[PDB]
Amino acid sequence: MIVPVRCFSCGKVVGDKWESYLNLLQEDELDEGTALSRLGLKRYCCRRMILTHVDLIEKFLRYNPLEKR
Template identity: 50%
Template structure:
């Protein structure tokens, strides 16, 4: 589905980093280096971005 707005564990906003993270990883950059560069330091917040699967385009036709 859509990327969560906040981290489930600590409550920090993580959705603001999703587009930059997604595009840079698709261009071939290392995910850990991208998260470091974006300033996402906590492990729980990093988990939210690394483990997210974007299914909006798959589910949207069925709504």
């Protein structure tokens, strides 16, 4: 749903690069591979972690909250 905190294979921290990856794709008009390389993800285990992630939390946030406060 949300970006994983750690890479499954090796344990590198990748949960702090989702916003940077999206910003590189949108504002900088960079390709996915170039953005992944620029973010410091060298091993394809982390490259797939960030490349194949699907952000379903954005869709889940479209529903009105069940409980208010």
